[model samples]
Target chain A: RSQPIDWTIEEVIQYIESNDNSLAVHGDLFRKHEIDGKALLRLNSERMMKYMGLKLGPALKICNLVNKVN
Target chain B: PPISSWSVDDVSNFIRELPGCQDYVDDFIQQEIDGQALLLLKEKHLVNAMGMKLGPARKIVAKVESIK
Candidate 1:
């Protein structure tokens, strides 16, 4: 099953979680690229979660899970 | 010869209903209702009253208040 939303950051986090990709790769994508376009989407979602007082511990756990996933 | 075993409720009742503990017991009950109560019986009160220092009584209070 699948759906879409009105583009909130948590929605973006959900999208990111669904993806079969590495966080380090995701980080590299943003940092290595010039700017704009996809960077805005990814970075904005991460920034929103940080601003909303979500603890870093869980986020890192998710990242670690993704990284370990073949 | 073996010692007689006292029941938990009996012991708790003795701690709660003992005549000299009227004030301390009242304070204990009030603190318990407030969720701020840790140990129910004060060691000093127990020591002065029973003379034996009530090891099992102290153990029960300590176990209840334990943070684990």
Candidate 2:
């Protein structure tokens, strides 16, 4: 939804944290990706895996979660 | 079994069993949102992207969220 586009990085991290317990352990990496002022849709699996150092499973988990709204 | 452990068929059957959600069985299936992906859904995605009404969207998201 359009509302998620306006969400701060903290909120995005919170959403990811809430959904995937496995990813919650990597909060700093998630925050390091710096999603501030960006749409959630922009955070794809490739970027997450590359930039955030997320493994395939966690990458897909976040990607599937963000992609659902787009 | 937990929603996390469910198969696509299990998810489809579960969605089909919901009062208003049954109508979207094909929608969910066609979208290829398997059991694991199903956990990622939000009410807005169901409403805006999937063309589901707010009531049923909320209902389904709430049900999904209820899963541990």
Q: Pick the candidate with the highest DockQ.
A: 2
Candidate 2 per-residue lDDT, tens place, B1-68, comes to 76666666787887888775247788777554556667766776677656788888888888888865
The worst-scoring run of ten residues by lDDT in candidate 1 chain A lies at A52-61
Residues A1-70 of candidate 2: C-alpha lDDT, one tens digit per residue: 4367787888887877787665577677756767653656777755765566655445556777677656
- Cα lDDT listed for each candidate: 0.35, 0.69
**Which candidate leads the pack in TM-score?**
2
**Chain A TM-score values, per prediction:** 0.26, 0.78
Overall local distance difference test of candidate 2: 0.69
Scored by TM against the true chain B, the candidates give 0.29, 0.82
